[PDB]
Amino acid sequence: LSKMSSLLERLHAKFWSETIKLVRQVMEKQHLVSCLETLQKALKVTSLPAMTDRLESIARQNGLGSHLSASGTECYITSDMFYVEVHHGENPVSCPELVQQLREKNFDEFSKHLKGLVNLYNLPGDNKLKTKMYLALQSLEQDLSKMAIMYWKATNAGPLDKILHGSVGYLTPRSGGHLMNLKYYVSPSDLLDDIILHENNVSRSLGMNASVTIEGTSAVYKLPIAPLIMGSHPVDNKWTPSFNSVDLPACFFLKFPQPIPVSRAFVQKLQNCTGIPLFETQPTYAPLYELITQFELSKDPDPIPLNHNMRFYAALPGQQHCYFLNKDAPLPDGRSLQGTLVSKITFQHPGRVPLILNLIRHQVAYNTLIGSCVKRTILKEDSPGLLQFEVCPLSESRFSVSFQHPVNDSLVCVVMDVQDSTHVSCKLYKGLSDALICTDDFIAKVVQRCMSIPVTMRAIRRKAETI
Amino acid sequence: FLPLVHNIIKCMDKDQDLNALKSKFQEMRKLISTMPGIHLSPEQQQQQLQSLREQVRTKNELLQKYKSLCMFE
C-alpha cells in the first residue's frame, strides 16, 4: 500500500560512475531465489534460443538426460517426441503434425504435451516398460487411424450420423499439438454456420472436444505391439486379434471431464468387455439428475450464488416459464436413481468395444440434453406461462413432460424414451374425453431432432396449444 | 533494457566490464532522450500545440475573410 521502495529507499539500501568493482573482487562465491534468469519469457520474446535454453535449464533442474552441440537447438528426450523443426527407437521424424501448430510463434504445445507424455509414460519399470511398453502402445495406437479411414470410406453419406452420433469414427491423429480424442459431446442444436460446414474431418480442435488418453498402472492386459489388422473390412470394421503379446504396462484411461450420470445396466454391460467396470470405488448413489444438472451448467455459472433448490424455472419463446426435475424422488422402481459421480476412466485394451462406449455416451448426452432447459435462467414468481413439468426418470432414459393442455382440465404427460441415439420416442397418452391437442409423429420427430426440454415446452405452448 | 541485465548477469555468473558498458549505454540513452527539448511533460505541450494550431487556423480564416470581401471603391 505504498511505493517507498522504488526510488526513495531502494537505491539508498543497495548493500555510480566509479563504484562498479563488483565483478572480480566480490565474486568469490532459478526456482524461488533467482527470478531474473527464470523470467526469460518477460525480458526477451519467446525465440528459438530462449526456449532451447529454458528447456535445458528445466532438464538440469528437474532431471532429464538431454543435450546438444551448443545453445540454439534442443530436442525432447522421450519415446518419440524427439523432433527438430526447420536413433534409440524411431528415427528423426519431421511430420507436419508437430510442425503445423508450433510453426512460428506458438507457445502452448511446448510444455504441456511433453510434460504430459512424460508423466504418463512414467512407472516403476526400469528399461522394461518406461520405453519398451511405451513404444509398443504408441505403435499399437495406429489401427484406429486405419479404422477411422475405413469408417469414413464406408460412411460416405455425411459425417453426422456415423462420426458423432450412432457409433465411433470421429477420431483424429494423435501426434504433437493434438492428442487422441473422440466425439464425446453430440450437441446438434448449437450455434451452427447460419452437419458443420467443413472441407474434411475435424481434428477435434476447432471448438470443444473431449481428451482421450492412454495410461495405466495395473491394467497390464494382453494386446498387440504392432498394427496387423489393416485391410478394409466387409461393412463397417473388423477386430484385431493379438496374442506376439506381452504384459504391456499400459491401458486406455481417458479423461472424463464431468461425472456424467449413467444407468446401472450400462455399467454392468460394459463391465464384461474390458475386464471390470468403468470405475472401482464406492458408487455415489445420490440423486443423479440433481448433481448432473449442476455439473453441466457449472461451466457458464459465475461466482454469484444460484440457490436453485430443485427449482427449474426458465424462460420461454416470448415470456417466462417454470419446470421441475423430480430429483431425489424415489419412484416406483424402488431404489433411487443410481449415481456415477466419479472421474475414474481407467479402461483396458481395445477389445470388443465397438458399442461398449457409444451406448453410455448417447445415454449421458440424452441426460444432459434433458436438463439443458435450465442453464442460466433464474426467474421465479412468473404468473404468466410457468409450463411446469417434471422429468420422471422411472426407467433408464425414460423422461416425461407435463403440460396444461386445453384438451382436459389437468396436465398432459408424454412418454419420452431414447430409443435410438438421435431418434428418441416421443409418444403421448391422451384422455378418453380430450380434444386433439396431441400432435402427430411429425412434431414428435421434430422435438427428437431438437432434443431440448425448452424447445418442447415452447412447441407445446405455441404449436400444440393452438390457443 | 534486456541486454543490459543480460550482460550484467553474464559478467556476474560467468565464472569483463559489462557494468561499465551498461552504465555508458544508459547515460547515452538518457542524453538522447533529453536531447528532444521538451523539458515539461508532453501533455501540456500537446495542449499548447493544439491551441496554437487552432489559433493559426482562426487567423488564416480571418485573413482570408478579410482579403476576400474587397468591394469598396
Binding site: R10 | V5, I8, I9, T34
Partner: peptide, 27 residues
C-alpha cells in the same frame, strides 16, 4: 523530460545491480 528519465535510469541501474548481486549470491 529530463528528471523522469534520470530517475528511470537510476532505478534501472539499481535493479540491475540488485539482480547481479542476487545472481552472484545464488549461482
Amino acid at each position: 523530460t529530463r528528471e523522469r528519465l534520470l530517475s528511470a535510469l537510476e532505478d534501472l541501474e539499481v535493479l540491475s545491480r540488485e539482480l547481479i548481486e542476487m545472481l552472484a549470491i545464488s549461482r
